[PDB]
Amino acid sequence: ATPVTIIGLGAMGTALANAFLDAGHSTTVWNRTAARATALAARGAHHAETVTEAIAASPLVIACVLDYDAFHETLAPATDALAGRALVNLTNGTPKQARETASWAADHRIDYLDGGIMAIPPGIATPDSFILYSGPLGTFEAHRSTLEVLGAANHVGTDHGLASLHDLALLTGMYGMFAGILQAFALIDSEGIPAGDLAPMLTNWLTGMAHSVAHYAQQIDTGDYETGVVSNLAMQSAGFANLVQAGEDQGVDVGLLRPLFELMRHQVAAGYGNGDVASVIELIRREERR
Amino acid sequence: ATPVTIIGLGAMGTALANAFLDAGHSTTVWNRTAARATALAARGAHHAETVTEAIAASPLVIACVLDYDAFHETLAPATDALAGRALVNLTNGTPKQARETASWAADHRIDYLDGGIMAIPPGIATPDSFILYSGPLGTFEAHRSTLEVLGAANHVGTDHGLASLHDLALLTGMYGMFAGILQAFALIDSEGIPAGDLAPMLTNWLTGMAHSVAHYAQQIDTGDYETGVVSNLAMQSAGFANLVQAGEDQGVDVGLLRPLFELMRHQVAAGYGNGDVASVIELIRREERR
Numbered sequence: 001a002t003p004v005t006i007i008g009l010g011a012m013g014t015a016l017a018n019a020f021l022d023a024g025h026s027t028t029v030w031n032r033t034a035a036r037a038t039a040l041a042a043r044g045a046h047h048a049e050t051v052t053e054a055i056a057a058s059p060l061v062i063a064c065v066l067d068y069d070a071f072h073e074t075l076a077p078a079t080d081a082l083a084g085r086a087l088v089n090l091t092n093g094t095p096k097q098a099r100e101t102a103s104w105a106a107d108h109r110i111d112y113l114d115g116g117i118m119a120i121p122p123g124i125a126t127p128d129s130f131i132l133y134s135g136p137l138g139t140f141e142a143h144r145s146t147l148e149v150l151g152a153a154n155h156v157g158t159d160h161g162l163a164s165l166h167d168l169a170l171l172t173g174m175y176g177m178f179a180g181i182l183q184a185f186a187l188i189d190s191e192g193i194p195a196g197d198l199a200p201m202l203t204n205w206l207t208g209m210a211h212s213v214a215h216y217a218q219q220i221d222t223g224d225y226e227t228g229v230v231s232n233l234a235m236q237s238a239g240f241a242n243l244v245q246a247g248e249d250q251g252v253d254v255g256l257l258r259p260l261f262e263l264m265r266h267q268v269a270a271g272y273g274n275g276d277v278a279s280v281i282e283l284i285r286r287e288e289r290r
Numbered sequence: 291a292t293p294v295t296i297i298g299l300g301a302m303g304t305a306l307a308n309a310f311l312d313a314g315h316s317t318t319v320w321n322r323t324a325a326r327a328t329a330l331a332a333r334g335a336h337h338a339e340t341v342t343e344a345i346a347a348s349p350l351v352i353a354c355v356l357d358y359d360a361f362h363e364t365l366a367p368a369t370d371a372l373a374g375r376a377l378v379n380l381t382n383g384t385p386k387q388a389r390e391t392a393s394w395a396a397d398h399r400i401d402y403l404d405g406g407i408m409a410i411p412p413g414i415a416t417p418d419s420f421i422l423y424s425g426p427l428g429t430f431e432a433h434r435s436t437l438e439v440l441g442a443a444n445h446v447g448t449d450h451g452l453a454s455l456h457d458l459a460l461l462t463g464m465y466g467m468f469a470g471i472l473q474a475f476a477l478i479d480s481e482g483i484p485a486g487d488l489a490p491m492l493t494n495w496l497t498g499m500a501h502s503v504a505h506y507a508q509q510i511d512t513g514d515y516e517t518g519v520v521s522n523l524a525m526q527s528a529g530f531a532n533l534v535q536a537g538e539d540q541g542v543d544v545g546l547l548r549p550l551f552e553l554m555r556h557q558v559a560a561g562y563g564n565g566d567v568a569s570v571i572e573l574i575r576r577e578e579r580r
């Protein structure tokens with residue numbers, strides 16, 4: 001079993017360390033706040049006093065801290081200790097930060113993968129969990145068996161920015177859903193109905209309507225927003241006007257959905273009402289792709 | 291089999307009519323534009339030339355036009371002809387419009403249910419379809435077997451505004467999800483990647499993270515946004531900042547999701563960063579429920 005070092009013992013990093021300990025790896029851990037390592041150390045983890053001690057302990061170093069600023073602040077002084085090792089950054093960040101970190105790593109003989117954890121901490125090391133990786137295939141395949149302790153391992157390309165691009169796209173979908181869920185519960189709440197009374201029906205509706213994804217992708221990829229439309233944009237915008245009006249009638253703030261509402265009305269007025277709602281992507285995608 | 295009249299033969303009204311034809315009901319149809327009624331007559335429907343002729347053919351009349359303005363313009367002149375019949379309004383509208391319509395119906399001896407179709411036209415009469423109804427239980431139970439031709443029939447309350455409230459709440463959830471899907475595809479599109487390349491991952495992610503619905507509902511219903519939190523709001527806001535920044539750096543308009551980003555920031559700056567993201571509901575729900 002490959003020895004592994006975890007840098008960062010928040011909710012996610014603690015889950016990673018526990019998963020490697022469960023799988024029998026010699027697991028070295030470090031956290032800015034040392035007290036977050038105490039339970040892990042009692043469990044058999046090697047609690048390093050410094051970042052450099054932690055890094056020197058293992059051929060594979062996994063970083064999972066709050067953000068890029070934390071990642072940079074923590075590892076920049078330890079550049080020399082990372083020489084010759086594999087660094088897997090599971091800290092959330094942008095494609096730009098991943099490509100800049102990759103340039104730094106190539107300048108200092110650090111093998112580098114950028115990754116995005118598509119799981120919550122209790123999901124780590126369960127069939128729910130998968131993690132996206134980008135960077136050199138040699139580094140990915142060398143550590144794939146170790147990484148698969150955490151969940152499925154999906155290498156999405158050699159361009160180091162690609163795992164974060166996919167990560168952030170998935171989070172983007174998720175947060176739109178979350179906004180919808182909050183606003184849906186706010187509307188039902190406005191008549192004194194518990195959220196739990198709506199939750200089963202809402203779960204089923206969102207599950208079923210989550211198959212719009214492939215349909216929407218096909219419309220976008222072909223540029224055809226008109227063929228086979230059964231829910232036209234003019235009708236959808238009329239219904240959207242009513243859920244906005246109903247929220248206002250019931251004293252609910254509907255600001256979260258106003259941007260989409262306004263875009264859909266704009267598109268109806270521009271003549272696209274007989275097509276599907278996905279045509280709105282033409283108003284937000286980057287100019288060179290329109 | 292109860293004779294049925296369908297008023298309004300757009301994409302969804304036509305699906306309703308076809309379902310009753312396939313189930314062997316004598317199906318009378320009317321549409322403002324005659325061509326949609328002629329098309330259904332070729333499939334066995336009875337094409338009524340006028341609204342009153344359509345209404346007088348059946349003890350059960352189902353309306354499915356664009357909005358309540360269309361419903362009122364169409365049916366107000368035929369008010370006396372509806373006396374003694376059951377009118378089921380599946381036109382999208384608000385709770386206030388449902389209640390106003392119910393008052394009109396009661397004043398004129400019209401049995402009235404207000405409903406919301408949670409299906410798309412090709413889903414009618416399949417296991418995917420369900421329709422929410424509100425109004426008197428006696429009327430609902432009298433026509434339930436006929437209504438179940440179209441999908442599951444869920445009576446959600448005696449107040450006629452309640453079906454619309456549930457309907458609009460589900461649509462509210464769905465449009466938040468749609469905003470997330472469009473923004474997600476816009477992000478992946480900004481690097482030249484086809485939307486279809488992301489579709490399987492995104493479908494599975496949204497399907498999975500849609501089980502946050504019950505967890506969110508329990509957090510809202512208990513008012514406890516801190517117990518059992520494994521993805522704290524401060525961390526979620528940091529990742530949200532990256533998906534916003536990544537979109538902007540690639541020339542994507544991220545305005546669809548910027549309002550939620552702002553509410554999460556607000557709750558973090560207000561000291562709720564250690565709890566879950568559902569605490570944002572306190573900023574949007576009706577004041578009397580806070």
Ligand SMILES: NC(=O)c1ccc[n+]([C@@H]2O[C@H](COP(=O)([O-])OP(=O)(O)OC[C@H]3O[C@@H](n4cnc5c(N)ncnc54)[C@H](OP(=O)(O)O)[C@@H]3O)[C@@H](O)[C@H]2O)c1
Binds near residue numbers: 074120
């Ligand atoms: N939790 C999830 O559901 C989830 C899911 C997918 C991905 N992730 C990703 O996992 C990463 C960590 O998230 P988490 O849930 O573990 O967050 P968390 O529980 O808030 O932990 C934050 C971690 O970052 C460290 N940190 C913050 N600022 C630092 C600095 N300036 N220098 C050194 N360390 C610093 C903290 O150290 P202290 O303990 O000393 O404060 C702690 O180890 C994030 O990038 C997140 O996007 C999380």
Ligand SMILES: NC(=O)c1ccc[n+]([C@@H]2O[C@H](COP(=O)([O-])OP(=O)(O)OC[C@H]3O[C@@H](n4cnc5c(N)ncnc54)[C@H](OP(=O)(O)O)[C@@H]3O)[C@@H](O)[C@H]2O)c1
Binds near residue numbers: 299302355
């Ligand atoms: N996926 C869906 O399609 C879907 C799903 C659930 C619920 N619904 C609901 O179903 C209802 C109808 O939607 P749809 O998809 O069938 O829309 P549609 O295909 O655009 O049809 C609109 C219908 O409204 C009629 N109409 C519009 N203005 C009118 C007026 N002033 N007087 C009389 N009739 C008028 C149209 O008649 P003409 O043909 O003469 O224009 C047509 O019959 C909406 O309230 C919608 O929210 C639709």
